[PDB]
Symmetry: C2
Subunit: 313 residues, 2 copies
């Protein structure tokens, strides 16, 4: 008997030790666009040294012009409108804001905030139904109330910020709609591999998208979760492309590199190491799922297939 | 028709603009004693330069050795124990912890904390009854909950701090009684002159004290409110001492100077200026009250007398 299979390590952590305690500022709104903004039409760049990749390697771009995806960090409502306008210049299909944040978030007087718990795990362990209910209740309770919104500084703790009596509350769905984007939420936990339920949900959603749909993925910082779903999308839509090519190109347009690399972590961040290794293994396992289930049109859900073909550390 | 008389300027401020937003750390517990600790038996020191006083002036100490009062900043439970043991060496009478804080405060896992709003006015405008009810409710609601406790830093906003799930909650009353001290609460608003009700309450309390009672006054910092009541007590108990000597001596044992001086605040603190001036005028008005009503045994209280003898700017 195995208590938690590879891919579900986070289930072993105790939600009660990471409860939310502050409204974290998700973006100061100073730039025109959110951070790490990138699209599948972008030129590839030299790889980051930390990943020890082959700078001489030239990844195939097969399928990228038709991929129609982008990624970024969280944003203010104005920044999202700039994103939507830029994307509208690349397509005539519907543009989706794919919100990958399990953490409860929204907009207080137009300011993008999130209910932050240690490691950003305030909704760890909650079903998507429970996470969205927490977010709705929490946002609604902020209206007409005095709140403290602050960015994190020294050691993931509030630093400075501001106090205000909220006069307007909005969900991301409303902000997305106000920007001309369709909205789709996948409540993925920060820093770890998306769960079987997150991916099953994504896959069912992907199946019914119109051909010209454009997917704009985003999390809080736009690196981990955002690149994982960009990679999954690239694998699903371009199954003939090699794993190496998918991983290099998604990294070289500005995303994370999801292949093996020398993991290094500050002492205070040593807890992340096993999550990074798990992600490497699960990326490979998902590629395998795509290669072995595409011919019959994915009759078998990812969650079911994963349980019959467990990943190995 | 005057909207607010001198001595009640604070009533013009709007409570809704200073609502509490964070559990402020009241003392880091690093020292054996609370800050600004001082007793009426202490030697007089040179006056602080900012008050532009006469360093060569030697105030009369008449009655100081029998005064039996002390003052300090807020404290951890251990620090209070140290205070109590130290005061027990000076008397055989009851030792009172006289809590002058209107702001809701208490102890979380033994940590002295307060519900802080801008200017420390989270309870501005509440009656003492409502202030104490808010306090009891907020303390109890913290039990078994995740809370954020932080010291204020730059701009009087949270800086660093800690997060924990509270396993113990106590009011200051419990902490005082466990330290072997009697407890008396006067809900005085931070930074301003105490209200006619705060003072009527103190004088009725003073009237019930056995002659050997020792009064240990304290607020958050141990300066404004603490010194005001120390002065009032000095005036009540030593009515033949000149106003100048009371003011010089309460300052020279380590308290605030409540006489006239060239008020110079930082631009961010200019709101303080009129409250300082108001304090200087009320100090004098309270002294008149004592001089005019002590001979008949205070048949008429301060609030009443004040209304028929209004202070003037
Ligand atoms: Cl779910």
């Amino acid at each position: 008997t195995v208590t938690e299979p590879v891919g579900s390590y986070a289930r072993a952590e105790r939600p009660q030790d990471f409860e939310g305690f502050v409204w974290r500022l998700d973006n100061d709104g100073k730039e025109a666009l959110p951070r790490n903004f990138r699209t599948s039409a972008d030129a590839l760049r030299a790889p980051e040294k930390k990943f020890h990749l082959d700078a001489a390697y030239v990844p195939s771009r097969e399928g990228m012009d038709a991929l129609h995806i982008s990624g970024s960090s969280a944003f203010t409502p104005a920044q999202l409108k700039n994103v939507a306008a830029k994307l509208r210049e690349k397509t005539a299909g519907p543009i989706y804001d794919v919100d990958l944040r399990q953490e409860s978030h929204g907009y207080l007087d137009g300011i993008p905030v999130s209910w932050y718990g240690e490691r950003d795990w305030a909704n760890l362990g909650k079903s998507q139904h429970e996470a969205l209910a927490d977010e709705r209740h929490r946002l609604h309770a902020a209206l007409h109330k005095t709140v403290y919104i602050a960015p994190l500084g020294k050691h993931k703790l509030p630093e400075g910020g501001e106090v205000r009596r909220v006069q307007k509350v909005q969900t991301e769905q409303e902000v997305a709609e106000a920007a001309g984007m369709r909205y789709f939420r996948i409540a993925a936990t920060d820093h770890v591999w998306p769960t079987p339920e997150n991916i099953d949900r994504f896959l069912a959603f992907y199946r019914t998208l119109p051909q010209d749909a454009w997917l704009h993925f985003h999390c809080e910082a736009g690196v981990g979760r955002t690149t994982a779903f960009m990679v999954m999308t690239d694998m699903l839509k371009n199954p003939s492309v090699s794993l190496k090519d998918i991983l290099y190109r998604q990294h070289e347009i500005g995303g994370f590199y999801y292949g093996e690399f020398p993991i290094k972590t500050k002492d205070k961040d040593s807890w992340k190491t096993k999550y990074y290794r798990e992600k490497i293994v699960m990326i490979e396992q998902f590629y395998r799922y795509v290669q072995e289930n595409r011919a019959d049109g994915y009759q078998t859900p990812w969650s079911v297939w994963l349980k019959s073909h467990p990943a190995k550390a």
